[model samples]
Target chain A: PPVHPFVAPLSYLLGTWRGQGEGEYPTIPSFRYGEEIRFSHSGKPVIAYTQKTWKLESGAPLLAESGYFRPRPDGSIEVVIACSTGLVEVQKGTYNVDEQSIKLKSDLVGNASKVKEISREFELVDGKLSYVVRLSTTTNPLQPLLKAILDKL
Target chain B: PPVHPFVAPLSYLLGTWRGQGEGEYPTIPSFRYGEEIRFSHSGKPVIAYTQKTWKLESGAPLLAESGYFRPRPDGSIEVVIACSTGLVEVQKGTYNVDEQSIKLKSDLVGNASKVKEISREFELVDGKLSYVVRLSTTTNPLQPLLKAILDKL
Candidate 1:
């Protein structure tokens, strides 16, 4: 079967993405890491997501997260993601077809995570996907934490 | 690199598993479904997990869940899973090497799910892995909802 029609708007993201990203935080030094992300569908309306990163210097494995992306009939996106750190987030968002972009904000953050909230934005232009993640923790307010530009493969 | 030492006890669960399972619930009739599960690692202390099920009659996709399995030095397991249905669960449990089994009970359930709690048990014997899931919802108490036996591949 073919991909679900509801997710046709997101077909551009339906592949593997590879690139390097920078991580920054007020409490820690900035660092570079390698990232790989996948968006897949099994003829279902939802897209399965998985991501992993590793330290660029030592090739040491970093954190990973996986979940699903559900696109509604109204162009709204429902995302549920779980991290290796034992944190989970439920996010609600919207997508723009013209801009080839999507934005999301967390509705609830659960489990052992100290993150108060999270916001994400993704834009695809000329086959390049760039995204930024901004998050707030118990001690820090929302700020750019990670940003990466990946190529679709 | 090889598998993480911290997850050595769960090495048997690494790789892919394929089989069929039955689904039962108080609000629905029993049904048959096909299943596939994968447990993997990136030389990290945690094991990445993913599972999917599909209807046997028509090969219609059912659902999927993926996350991580973190085993501690004390034989306790910390699991976090996010389902395609928009639910996330943080589970805590233990593994018995002698019995080649692991059991877990949810510490928290989050997001748009109506499930109140979830419990799981997995046993490996002679290359066959069997597991059962029991869940409680707003309308029903804890009861067996899914059970399956899969072979390593």
Candidate 2:
């Protein structure tokens, strides 16, 4: 929760964020959605996270994920995300606390027949939140799949 | 999650939010903390939720809670919050979606040996999340115990 020894590298990520997003895939049609993500801490080094997406126009639920984040002693970050689609990713990367930005790529994936790898970047600046998430999968080519910009509410 | 028809009234509550808070009490010292709250939908009438708080300055954790929220056919909401402090609250209320605000009062609180009664108002206005929660029971009279203002990330 605090800039404790274990979370110094990623303490900047500590709250709820909302935004609008677009998705594209080689096997599916392009689409738009609303995204909401929340991060929390227990006064410990660990941060719990959960996210959900809905159709922007209809306000219908579309997707969801659950996970956690931790910072390594070496100044890198570790993240694990699991989707209801049977996709799971273990990722690692860097966080620029002062810049309020992050860049992360997966180290491994499980049950990856649907999704084999993932990478993403998040930026919080100018009263807005934005991000791009790319994917590597068994049936589709590696490509950017999720991009969003959300005004702080 | 696919949106079933039952949760239409409360689905608007799904999202994550960040904010700052303060507490005042005659039985305890006044202080401030950081807060993060998340709400997720399961295509049913109910929404899952989790919340956590930390010290504002040091980022140390204070307390946490998890529960569910359901919207009734009567246009009211049902919420259950179980706290790490070993207290649980069941609440009911109404939401004015057009106004982006809510008013709720506890129906019952289990294991409330140390505390009881909770009423709150949550508003999303001026690009910030704000709320006032008051409690009744034990040695303290019904009074405002917590207030917070959180910017959407």
Candidate 3:
């Protein structure tokens, strides 16, 4: 696979971040949950990607997934992701240099249904990164899906 | 002094966080610097505050200051801060519901005077909390500053 130019700077994000958050599903009451996400990069030209999330407090399986990340010819990055729910989502977007952020628009379909997600990542501070993920076709407001203070342990 | 509604949530941030950062400044050079920031709250209605930064790799003092955070009549937060170097800054901003995050626009005076700052919190997988600072005055791209991933004793 051809390496993407943007992969190098993003290499700093290849690690695991864990934290607690509360989730609200429209039909259900809000619940507190713990989460962990692992980010990694292969030394190859285009970075290989994998991510796993679990409920810390409940010790339940939340999500397990993997994907490939590559820079497209148009300067946007593409993420091909597959999840344990037997669902697949392709996210396409570009990293904004001025804002030091990445914006991804995703198209997801499974079980004869479709959904959309818009996600943005901002490196507010060097080691501290935050993201807001908003979903269409869902009643919830924009949620802070991923927030990590990165460190090599 | 009446307790500001935002003070309680701000109190959760009173602690020390440790992390590493990569950036360049005229006086600081271009290199990766380890850093820490301490936030202290005096358990007062008005919420007295103090912060200090240190170079982690070299264990040297970089910046130190103290201030007060109070609620404005307009429902915003006001920060009156002074550093050991005789520089005083007044920042006005608001807190996100998480309270772990703050958006501050400050008036800085000195050689590099005046900028807006956005500060947010990052929590580790182990439930440790840290802070990341973003500034708006730099000619170079905005990056995280003096972020620390902290663990409680």
Candidate 4:
């Protein structure tokens, strides 16, 4: 396959990021869930993604989604994200080359809902690392998104 | 005397700044000068001053000159300056609120002096402190001019 000039630079970002996430909820008991997100580049104009949330012990998938990410002319990256809950988002932000990180501020607009997400950090890490995702305006903590220990397939 | 609240914010910059200067002839020769400047605040007021250069090391009087530094209504500073050597300069720029620094860009001038300076890290300590002024020019590195300006201050 012919490699695009941007492919090598973008490939370093491709991988699975898994961690535990905690947040509070209004009605339900505090819970933890296994979380995993994968980023892949195919030498195309855009990047592809898949995200999943599962029961921590059962490995039962609770939620799953996909998305496409593109770079804008003004040097901001945009992501067109779709989720199982009928949520769609057009997120925009800049990428820090030296940090190898994407700092995004996203605005989600759906048929009947609108929401904003600010400052999400997706850092590449090794092994069963821990992470947290918190909502801005709420105290509700989502269950920990955990990754099971893996062996080379 | 009662402190008048009507005094403009830029009044603090209304005096001459002088110090020992070191510079080269074409680029780096040795010369010392005492620069005395006076500013007038009246009518549609701004900071106006002139610099007189005298050889501090050699005890020789170099020259005397005058200029106007005025703040426009739109919050920009304008400078009209002339020297005894038959040179005139007009610069347009902005003043920082802290009064510790002013940055002016030459819009029109009768001589070949480019105007871009930043007073970095200014403070008074133990009856003696320093302001590090960095200058840049179209013709050469700004360090020489900065050294010359600092010589008078």
**lDDT top scorer:** 1
Using alpha carbons, what is the TM-score of model 4? 0.39
Between candidates 1 and 2, which one is better according to lDDT? Answer: 1
Cα lDDT of all candidates, in order? 0.87, 0.71, 0.49, 0.47
Q: Residue-wise lDDT of candidate 2 within B1-153, one digit each (tens)?
A: 576675665455567888779998887887889899876766766667677888767776777766656666656776665555544566778877777777889766654567778897777777577878998977777889899887655
Candidate number that wins on lDDT, 1 or 3: 1
Considering only N, C-alpha and C atoms within 3 Å, which residue pairs clash in candidate 1?
none
The residue-by-residue lDDT of candidate 2 on A11-115, one tens digit each, is 556678888888878767788898997776665556666678888777877777666666666657766655544344566787776787778897765444467
Instruction: Give the better candidate number (2 or 3) by DockQ.
Output: 2
Residue-wise lDDT of candidate 4 within A86-106, one digit each (tens)? 344455676655555554555
Q: Write the per-residue lDDT of candidate 1 for residues B72-114, one digit (tens) a residue.
A: 7788998888999888888899988888888999987877457
Return the interface RMSD of model 1.
1.1
Cα lDDT of model 4 by residue, B1-153, tens digit: 221233265555454466554444345566556555454433334343545556686545555444455555455665554443333344566655544445665444332245443222222322222333344556555553434443223
Looking at model 3 chain B, which ten-residue stretch has the lowest summed lDDT?
Answer: B107-116
List TM-score per model, in order.
Answer: 0.95, 0.50, 0.40, 0.39
Task: Please tell me how candidate 2 rates in CAPRI terms.
Answer: incorrect
How far in Å is the alpha carbon of A115 misplaced in model 2? Answer: 1.9
TM-score of chain A of each: 0.94, 0.85, 0.69, 0.69
Q: 2 or 4: which has the higher TM-score?
A: 2
Name model 3 segments beyond 4 Å from true.
Answer: A1-6, A72-75, A108-126, A138-153, B1-153
